[model samples]
Target chain A: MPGSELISGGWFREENDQWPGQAMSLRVEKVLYDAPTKFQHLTIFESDPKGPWGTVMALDGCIQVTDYDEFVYHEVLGHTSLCSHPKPERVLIIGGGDGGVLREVLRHGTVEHCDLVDIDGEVMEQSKQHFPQISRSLADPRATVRVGDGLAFVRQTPDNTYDVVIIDTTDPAGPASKLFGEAFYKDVLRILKPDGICCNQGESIWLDLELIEKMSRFIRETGFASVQYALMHVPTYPCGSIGTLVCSKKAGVDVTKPLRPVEDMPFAKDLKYYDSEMHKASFALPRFARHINN
Target chain B: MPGSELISGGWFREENDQWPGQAMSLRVEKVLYDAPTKFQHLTIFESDPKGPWGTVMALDGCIQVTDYDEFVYHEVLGHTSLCSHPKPERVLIIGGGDGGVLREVLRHGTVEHCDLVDIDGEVMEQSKQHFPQISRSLADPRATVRVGDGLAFVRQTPDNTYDVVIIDTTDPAGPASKLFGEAFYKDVLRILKPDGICCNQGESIWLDLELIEKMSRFIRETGFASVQYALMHVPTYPCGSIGTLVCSKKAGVDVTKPLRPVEDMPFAKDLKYYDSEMHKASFALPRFARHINN
Candidate 1:
C-alpha cells in the first residue's frame, strides 16, 4: 500500500508509484456535488481498480462518527431533554432524515407524536439504502416525516405547540448556517411548547471556539430561560470532540441541576452511557467556555 | 495524492513516493520492537535522497503528547482531584515525566511539592528537548525529579506522607498493568496522607470497560472514602479518549462540586482545553462508565 498525501484539503487521488508490491487503490465511482442547498459532495470510493465500487464509508472528515456508534448521538440528543422534563408528549426533530431521533424518542412512554422535517428526499432514500436500522424508525406510526424546508416549517408552526424541539442538523457552515443565527433561534422559540427545551449540535469546542462562543451568545439571547453547552468525547469527530447546546423556555429549568443519583432508573443497568453523575457534569464547562456565557 | 494505508491496528502510515519527472527511490529508516511496550511500535521513517537528516521535523509515531492541547488531559487529571480535596499540600505524580501534571498542580495555591517519577529518563530528556512550555515547571523549587520504577517508589513511601498520588503512566497492557491492580491501589492508599487523595490514568471508558471496572473496584476496596473517575477528550489517544480515577481518604471529597470558577485561579488563562464547568464534567462518565461502578 502506498502512502496517501493530502495537501491543502483534498481527497486522495490515484497514481501509485511505490509500495511493498501488493497494492490496493481507491477509485472514486461517483460524486454528487449539487445535493440540496449546500454543494454537498457524496463521493464513492472503491478499493479495487477493476471499476466496481467497493464498500462505501460515509464521512465528513471535518466531523467524524463511527458507523457503529450512531446509537450514542441518537440516544443523547433524543432522550436526555425529553426524559429530564416532566412530560414531553409532542416532540419535533428538524432535519433528522436518517430517523435516529425518532427512534430514540419512541423509547419514551409519553412521546405521542414526533414531527420530522427534511428538505432533501435523496438523503432519506440514501438512508433507507445504507442505514436501515435508523431509517426504519422514519416509518413509525407516531412519526410524521414532512418533506419541506425546516426553517419555514418551524416558522409556520403555532406557538407553544410542541413540548420539545431537537435541531439535528449539520454544521452552520453549510446551508444550515442560517439555523444558528438569531432568525432561526427566534422561530424555534416561537414553536417551542411552554415547558419546552431544545438542543442542537454546537460545533467542536476545541476547533470551533469562535463559532461556539458566537452561537452560545445567540442561543442565550434567543429568549430561552436557561442555556448551557455540554461536551462529548467523539473519536471520529474533528479534534476528537463534540458539543451540544441545551436550552429551556421555562424560567426555572436548569440543565445543570436536578442531577440526582441514578440509583432509581429501571434501565440503569441496561445503560451503556448517560449516568446521572455524568449527566450533571456534562452541563458544566471549563473557564474558557464559561467566559462565553458572560 | 494517495490515501494513507492502514499498517497496524487502525494506524495510518503516510509515505510520499510520487514525484513527477524525478528519480526518487524508496528507503527504510528505522524499526522499533519491544521498546516502548509490547503493543506500541515507534518506527522512524525518513525520505531525503538529496540531503541528510538536518532540520527535518522528526516524526515519531505513538508519542503520547503529540498534540499538546493543555485543557484536555492536563486540567482534568490535575485540577479535578486537587480541587476536590479540602486542601492538598503534597502531590506525587508517578510517570508524567513530561511535566503536564506538575504544571497543572502548580495552578493550585496550596500545592507545596510535586514528586515526579519516571522509569525511563530518556523520555523526559526527549520531552524537555521537544516540549519546553510544558516541562518548564519541572524546574520549580517545589518539584523533585526521580528516575526509577514507580511501583517500587510507591512501596517505599512512608504512610500518611503525601496529600495526593497521581499515576500518569503508560497503557495498562505492559509494565504499567501492575499500576491498575489491587495491590498497587493498596500501596497508594497506604502511602497517601490521612487526608490525601489518589488520581491515576484508567484508560478509556469506551473500550477498556473491564479494566476500568477493575480499577474502580480496587480503589473502592482499598477503603478510599470516595472514588470517582473522569473521562477526557483526546483525539489521537486510544479510542480518542482517556479516563482518570480520583480516590480520596477524606469523607466528603466529591469531584463534582462547584468550586470557584476557573477564572479565579491564580494563573492567567493561556489554556486551550480546561475551564471551570469542564472541571466538573470531565469527571462525568458515559452511563456505562458509571454502571460499571454500580
Candidate 2:
C-alpha cells in the first residue's frame, strides 16, 4: 500500500516498485470500502455508474478486477482449463480471494464441489460485499471457503484427488511467489487426478515472456506431461494482456482442445470470452511469442 | 514538429498532441536526419548498432517503422492483402514512404510492378538513408517511387488494374484522415481488379474501435463486397497495437483465407508473421472486440 497514491482524478495503483515502469489508474467517485488485512492492503473504489469501468478493487497496489473487463480475464482463466478436462467434478482454486474464479468454475454444471482457498479471509468478505456479481457463487451449497496458505493447502491434499487445480493467485511477488515455484508445482502434480489439469496465472507474454518461458519449463520439469501457454486480452492488466500456463499430469492432453464442447457448455451464453474457438486461438502465439515458448 | 522534445538519450517525437494520455519512448544515439517535407515532419533516429529495436523513423510524430518488429507490422499488413488475392501482379501502395510495405510486397514472385505513392519525399529519403534493412527494396527494378498525394494518385489510375492496394499511412489525423474515408475507398474500388483486396492501417482496436467500425461500414457502403478487420501486435504504437481493415471488391471473398499458401510463399521462411494460420487467427477478434465490431 506504500506505492498507492491519490492521483488527480482518483487513486493510482502503482506497481512500478514491483512491476517497475508500468501502472494503471482508475477514477473513483468515492472509496466504497477500505480495510487493512493482516496479510495485505485491501481497498475498493466505486466509480460513478456513468464512468467507463465502474467499481475497481485492488490489493497491495495491484489491480485485481475492474467492472469493465474482469469478465475477459476471469472467464478465459476459468473455462480454458475447466472445459479442457473431461469432467471437472472437483476443482481447487488457490488465492482467488475475489471469488471470480469460483463463479466461473461453478458455471460448469459438472463441478460438484469447489474449494476456494486464499490466505486472507477479510478480502473474501469485503469482496462479497463490494463485488457481488463476481462473488455470488461463493454462497452456493457445493462451495467451500478456506482461509489458509494455498501452497500448504495443496501440499496436504491427497494424491490424485482434485480433477482440476487452478492457481488464481496475485502477481508472482510477496507471498504468491512460492505458488509459482517448482515445489508447489510438484504438490499440484501430486494432488491432481491422473487425468487432471492445472492452470495458473502466467503473466503477460508481451511484458513477461522470460518469466512465462521459465515457468513453462518448470511445469514440464515437474513431470506434468504437457504444458502450454495461452493468453487473453484483458485491457486493465499491465500490458493489456494476461496469460495462462495450463499443464496436465497425464501425457497427450492437448489443453487447447476443449473436452466440453461449446454447444454443450451450460453457461455458454453467460461467457464474454473462452468459447471453444477462442481456447484454441489463445494458444496460437504470434511468431515472436512462439520464439519465447520454443 | 510542434510536439518534438529533447529527452534523455534521444530526441523524442511526441504525438501527445494527437494521441493524448499515452506515449512511446525510444532512446536514440543521435538524430541521423531531420527535415520538413511538403506534407509532414520527418525525423530518423539512428540507435546504437547493438540496441534491441535499432534505427526508428518517425513522420509527423508517429513511428513509421523500426529495425525490430517492423516486420511484425509490415509483413502482416502486406501479406494479408497480397496472399488473400489470387494473383497480385500490379500493386499500389499509398503513404508507406518508408518503403517497408514495398519490401514485403515484392517478396511474392507473382508481383510484376509496385507503385509507391506518398506526399512526403523527405520521409522516403531519410528512411532509405537511415533504415536500409527495411527500405532496401525501393531499389528493386519493379518498384516505382512517386512523390505525390495518394488520394489524387488513386483517382488517376485506370479502372480494374491493381490486384492489391496497401494504405500504410500515419494515424487517421490531418491529411491521412481522408484516405480512410468513403471518397478514397470509392477510388480504391474503382482501380482494384474484381478480386482485388485493399489493406489499410485502421488504427488500434483498443484506442480507436469506433473509428475502425465506422471505416468498415463506410467501405461496405462504397460497394465493396466484403470487409474484414485484422490486427497485429506493434509495441511502438499508441496502446501497443495496430489494426488493418481488409476489404475485397468481390463478394464472398474470405480474406482470412489466403490464396498464396504458406509453403508456396517465396519468402515464407523470411516472414516473421502473416503465415496462413496467422492470417486466419488475426481476424479472430476477442468477444469484446466482436461486440465493438457489431
**TM-scores for all candidates?**
0.75, 0.87
Model 2 pairs whose backbones collide: none
Candidate 2 lDDT, A1-294, residue by residue in tens: 343353333434444444443344444678876656788777688754443567888777677888767887788878999888988899999988888988888888888999989999888898888889988987889999999999989889999989999999888766787997889999999999999999989887666788888888888888999898886776567656788888889888888778777558556876776677678778877776776445
Candidate 1: which stretches are off by over 4 Å? A1-67, A84-87, A155-161, A193-195, A220-222, A249-252, A258-271, B1-60, B66-68, B84-87, B156-160, B173-177, B222-226, B249-280
**TM of chain B vs. native, candidate 1:** 0.78
Q: Least lDDT summed over 10 consecutive residues: which range in candidate 2 chain A?
A: A1-10
Docking class of 2: acceptable
Report DockQ per prediction, comma-separated: 0.27, 0.26
Q: Number of clashing pairs, model 1? A: 15
In the range A158-236, model 1's lDDT, one tens digit per residue, is: 9998888898886654446678788998888888878888888777665567887777777778788877776666543
RMSD of 2: 3.8
